[PDB]
Structure formats: structure tokens, C-alpha cells
């Protein structure tokens, strides 16, 4: 289906304890392929997915130089933003950056995005048009002016709908065996009595790829959207994903309820029901 | 590939 390339950057000031902590990670869909950590011994952009290792020394030299440049930019920005908000030098603060692009099945551009944060709150973000910025407060409006003058938007759009899309297609092709595969979910159901006249039915999906899945409960073939505990889709650690949905049911009326599973890997949506 | 047109805040 639709694919994405995303880069995530966290910068955390450690006042009195030297340089700020810098963590950069690259994602194709929900798979990490590159990493930089300031506290790591390498001081290199490191491969984290098998299919990126066929990139030559030029790629690794370039991404190391460019990720270091982003680190240095974050180091300056932390000091600047500390000034804007008139905050003490003793206080530890966080800058978070995410940018990326989405492509369809054909591999053509769908959309691009960039968002910046300070202390886990919206600072400034590129708009859907990829030509203007939304500033959270007066401090971010100063950044917007400096980004408008430097033509950050025009150069970012050129990346998001050009470079970003091109390198995503290359990654997707090189990592074809893992990135463009579809594993359907192995499904089962568990039963947990809370008390008398009551019980929890939990609908499981394991070993599926990609992460995109829909678990919904029904009563007499009618969707029970409201009273449903839907846990966060989690990684298995082997490259697959896990999820469950749960509903509280009065004991005796287990047969009334069904769990629906929609996923790409399936040839037909599954419909589970509790069995002794 | 990383974005490289880095402007300070």
C-alpha cells in the first residue's frame, strides 16, 4: 500500500554535564534503517536495517556530515530558544523534529510534512501547501520570519516532493523482501472472568506486517465501537507487529459477540467467536 | 537521505 520515509530528532540540554544529548533515527514505514547517538563511540550514522548496508562509503560519509550539521543546528537553537522564553541556564530543555514524505502504491508523491517542538509542545510546523508556516507562540513567530527570509519552505518542499520521494523508492526497492511483503495476522481469543455474571473477551492478532490493522468487536453482527479496550499496536522484535482488542461481556452471552480482523495480508476479512 | 538546507531558529 502507501509507504513513508520519516526522520526523528531529539535534542536534550544537560547543563553542567557537557554537550546536549542528540538522537537521530531514520524510518521507512515502521522500520528503523539509520541511527546517530552523540553518546555512542562511533560518531557515525550507523545502519539499523540489512538493506541500507549496500550503500557505499560516500552515503555513510555524507549522512554522518549532514546528521552532525543537524546536531550542531539543534545545539545553537537550544541556546537561542532558552533566550526567547527567558529561561534559566540551570533548566534542561528538549527540541524534537520530525519531517518525512508519503507515497502511494504506484510510488508517486502523496504529501509532505515537518513539525518542530520545544518541551513536548508545538513550536512551528510546515503547512499542507508546503509554502507557509504555523507558529505556536510569539517566540516561534521570530523563527518563522528567519525561515521566510532564508526560503526554508521552498528548499524543504524541493526535498519532500523530490529528494525524499526518490530515496524512498530506492530504499523500498533495495529492501523489497522485508519492506513490500505482507504477512497476515495469526488470530486467537482468550477468556478472563472478572467476577460472576461478567467476563473479558480479548481478540489477538500476531506476526502481521505491515502495522496497519483494524480490530473491531460486534454484538449480533452490529459494531460495538464505544465499549472496546483497543491496546497500542506494538513491535514483536522479529520485524512483525502485535495487537489486541477487548470487550466486557455478561457470562453466558459469549456467542453473541464476534471480532472482525481487516489486514492487507488477508485474502478475506476474518470473523472470530469464543469457543470452549 | 537527510534534509541538508539547515536554517537556525
Amino acid at each position, epitope marked *: 500500500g502507501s509507504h513513508s520515509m520519516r526522520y526523528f530528532f531529539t535534542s536534550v540540554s544537560r547543563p553542567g554535564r557537557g554537550e546536549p544529548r542528540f538522537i537521530a533515527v531514520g524510518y521507512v514505514d515502521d522500520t528503523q534503517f539509520v541511527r546517530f547517538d552523540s553518546d555512542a563511540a562511533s560518531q557515525r550514522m550507523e545502519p539499523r536495517a540489512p538493506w541500507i548496508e549496500q550503500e557505499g562509503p560516500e552515503y555513510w560519509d*555524507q549522512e554522518t556530515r549532514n546528521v552532525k550539521a543537524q546536531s550542531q543546528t539543534d545545539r545553537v537553537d537550544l541556546g537561542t530558544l532558552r533566550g526567547y522564553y527567558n529561561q534559566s541556564e540551570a533548566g534542561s530543555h528538549t527540541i524534537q523534529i520530525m519531517y518525512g514524505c508519503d507515497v502511494g502504491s504506484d510510488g508517486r508523491f502523496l504529501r509532505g510534512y515537518r513539525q518542530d517542538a520545544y518541551d513536548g509542545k508545538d513550536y512551528i510546523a510546515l503547512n499542507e501547501d508546503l509554502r507557509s508556516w504555523t507558529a505556536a507562540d510569539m517566540a516561534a513567530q521570530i523563527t518563522k520570519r528567519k525561515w521566510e527570509a*532564508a526560503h526554508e519552505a521552498e528548499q524543504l518542499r524541493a526535498y519532500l516532493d523530490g529528494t525524499c520521494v526518490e530515496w524512498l523508492r530506492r530504499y523500498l526497492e533495495n529492501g523489497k523482501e522485508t519492506l513490500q511483503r505482507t504477512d497476515p495476522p495469526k488470530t486467537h481469543m482468550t477468556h478472563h472472568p472478572i467476577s460472576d455474571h461478567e467476563a473479558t473477551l480479548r481478540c489477538w492478532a500476531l506476526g502481521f506486517y505491515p502495522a496497519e490493522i483494524t480490530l473491531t468487536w460486534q454484538r449480533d453482527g452490529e459494531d460495538q465501537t464505544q465499549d472496546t479496550e483497543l491496546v497500542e499496536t506494538r513491535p514483536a522484535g522479529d520485524g512483525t507487529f502485535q495487537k489486541w482488542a477487548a470487550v466486557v461481556v455478561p457470562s453466558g452471552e459469549e456467542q453473541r459477540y464476534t471480532c472482525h480482523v481487516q489486514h492487507e495480508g488477508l485474502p478475506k476479512p476474518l470473523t472470530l467467536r469464543w469457543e470452549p | 537521505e537527510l534534509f541538508s538546507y539547515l536554517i537556525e531558529k
Partner: T-cell receptor, first 114, second 111 residues
Framework: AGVTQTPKFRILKIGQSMTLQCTQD?????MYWYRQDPGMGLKLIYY???????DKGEVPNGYNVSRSTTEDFPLRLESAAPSQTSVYFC?????????????FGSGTRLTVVE | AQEVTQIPAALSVPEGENLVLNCSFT??????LQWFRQDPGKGLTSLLL?????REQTSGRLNASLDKSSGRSTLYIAASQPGDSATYLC??????????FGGGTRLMVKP
């Protein structure tokens, strides 16, 4: 005014130590050290993106730098060698992008002798 | 990595005649391109600064073009005169490598 570079020239024995001074009062976060052999272009030795950090350039070997303050960025030669005979240029900028270009010093002509 | 080249490294031109100085760079992802003048023993003098968005810059008898496609820049000197005689350096700035200089072209404008 701008970037001030001392000294203008120096004749130094093979192995002797020297500290090239570079100052700017424009409050620039970014400061750079280049060297230029005869008939060649400038080659980045070391740079600093602010007070308290330095990072190696293209030809950092045989050179040491510090950045205690925003103002100063001195370049130190631990042990002078024949290959370190060159013209040294210091630079500064407000941003990495430097949309007005870099502010450059006059230059320091270094001669290493046996 | 960013490799800036200037061929030829030397150019002899008679007074009054127009001339071209060549600059090629390998990384077309750039902030700006810069042309410097260097007199023997002296420092650098900034002639023109072309932004990545801009296509050309003009300052009197000096014109400079930018082509990120091929990764080339040309400096056009109109009605050349002995005063124009100097070493001309091509510099390219980007995040990864910062301001990176070519070898330079020693221009001789003969009377």
C-alpha cells in the same frame, strides 16, 4: 572591525610551538580556520559552531583549537613540521548558511625552518 | 564529499577582450556559491554571492551564473583590463562541508 588575526607573519623552528590568535566582536557563533599552500585554495582545518565546542575539518592533523568564549578561537601548533609552512586564514559567520558570506581575517604567513 | 575544481588553473588574455573562468562542484545541494579575488600576498575580496535559488549575479563588468543541474558556475569578465589580473577562487557553502574552495585560476590580463 570584523575578524582580527594575529600575528601577520612568524618564522618558527621545526618542533617549536605557536598560538595564532583570532578575535571577532560581532557575537558570531560560527568561527573557522583555513590554510592555503602556494597556487592552491583554502582548506578547512578546524571550526566551532559556538562557545564550548570544536569539530575537525578536512586537514585537522598537527593542529589544536579551543573556544572558551564566543569572541576568541585560537589555533595552536604543538610541533611545527615543514608541511605546516602555509598562509592561515581565520573566518566567522552569524549563521551556517552565511547569506552575506564569511567575514575573513587578513591572514598569517607561517614559515617553518630547520 | 564537496570537491570544487577550476580548469584551467592559468589563463592569459589580451587587454579589452572578454573572458570566462570555469568552476565545477560535485555536491549540488548548496546554500550559495561565491567568487573571490586574491592579489599576491593579500587576503580574499568577495566579488559576487549567488543564492541556491538565484540563477546569476551582476556587479559592474562582472557576471556570474549558477547551474546546480551540471554543478557548474562561470564568471564572465567584460572589457578585461590589467587591473583585473589576479587569482580568482570559486567557493561553495553547504551544511555538510561548509564553505569549500576550488584550486583557483591565475588570470593574466596582458597590456
Amino acid at each position: 572591525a570584523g575578524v582580527t588575526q594575529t600575528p601577520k607573519f612568524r618564522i618558527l623552528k621545526i618542533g617549536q610551538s605557536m598560538t595564532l590568535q583570532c578575535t571577532q566582536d560581532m557575537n558570531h557563533n560560527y568561527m573557522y580556520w583555513y590554510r592555503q599552500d602556494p597556487g592552491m585554495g583554502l582548506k578547512l582545518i578546524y571550526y566551532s559552531v559556538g562557545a564550548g565546542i570544536t569539530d575537525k575539518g578536512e586537514v585537522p592533523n598537527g593542529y589544536n583549537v579551543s573556544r572558551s568564549t564566543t569572541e576568541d578561537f585560537p589555533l595552536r601548533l604543538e610541533s611545527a613540521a615543514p608541511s605546516q609552512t602555509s598562509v592561515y586564514f581565520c573566518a566567522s559567520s552569524e549563521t551556517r548558511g552565511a547569506p552575506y558570506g564569511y567575514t575573513f581575517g587578513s591572514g598569517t604567513r607561517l614559515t617553518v625552518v630547520e | 564529499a564537496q570537491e570544487v575544481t577550476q580548469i584551467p588553473a592559468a589563463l592569459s588574455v589580451p587587454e579589452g577582450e572578454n573572458l570566462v573562468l570555469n568552476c565545477s562542484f560535485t555536491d549540488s545541494a548548496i546554500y550559495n556559491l561565491q567568487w573571490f579575488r586574491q592579489d599576491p600576498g593579500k587576503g580574499l575580496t568577495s566579488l559576487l554571492l549567488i543564492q541556491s535559488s538565484q540563477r546569476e549575479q551582476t556587479s559592474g563588468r562582472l557576471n556570474a551564473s549558477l547551474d546546480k543541474s551540471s554543478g557548474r558556475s562561470t564568471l564572465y569578465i567584460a572589457a578585461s583590463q590589467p587591473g583585473d589580473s589576479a587569482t580568482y577562487l570559486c567557493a561553495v557553502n553547504n551544511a555538510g562541508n561548509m564553505l569549500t574552495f576550488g584550486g583557483g585560476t591565475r588570470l593574466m590580463v596582458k597590456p
